[PDB]
Design a protein around this ligand. Structure first.
Ligand code: CA
Ligand code: CA
Ligand code: CA
Length: 161
């Protein structure tokens, strides 16, 4: 990978720059020149949704910083917001298909039934009839409990339609 930390920095968009300039201008509150030591960076972590300690950020600055002064800069800072993917609990593949569950379920009954499936068919431009709905729960259902569920739609989305 041609520079994984400097790539995002050197490749900054003008839209995210106007947002970092303000967020970065607050992290330097109390400092002298306009940077962040460790306690000032604690506010940067709280933004995502975490309250780490100022002692754990110090060891993280020497790995991102490229000078050796013991402080973060407008450049070494953006690097910290690049190594963390945009997903703390989510992931991919099996996590990307779970999104269909929302549009598939309507009242959180498990997944879809004879009345809920009518919405998943209307979203598709394909022509749907009454025989296509009764067939959806036929092979689409493995337990035949009356509706479907994430465990069933998992294989149903393996290229069936
Ligand atoms: Ca530095
Ligand atoms: Ca439902
Ligand atoms: Ca079932």
């Amino acid at each position: 990978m041609d520079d994984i930390y400097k790539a995002a920095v050197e490749q900054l968009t003008e839209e995210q720059k106007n947002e970092f300039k303000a967020a970065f201008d607050i992290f330097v509150l109390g400092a002298e020149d306009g940077c962040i030591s460790t306690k000032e960076l604690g506010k940067v972590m709280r933004m995502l949704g975490q309250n780490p300690t100022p002692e754990e950020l110090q060891e993280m600055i020497d790995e991102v910083d490229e000078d050796g002064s013991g402080t973060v800069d407008f450049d070494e800072f953006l690097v910290m917001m690049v190594r963390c993917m945009k997903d703390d609990s989510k992931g991919k593949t099996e996590e990307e298909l779970s999104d269909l569950f929302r549009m598939f379920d309507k009242n959180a009954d498990g997944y879809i039934d004879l009345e809920e499936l009518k919405i998943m068919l209307q979203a598709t431009g394909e022509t749907i009839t009454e025989d296509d709905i009764e067939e959806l729960m036929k092979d689409g259902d493995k337990n035949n409990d009356g509706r479907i569920d994430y465990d069933e739609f998992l294989e149903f989305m393996k290229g069936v339609e």
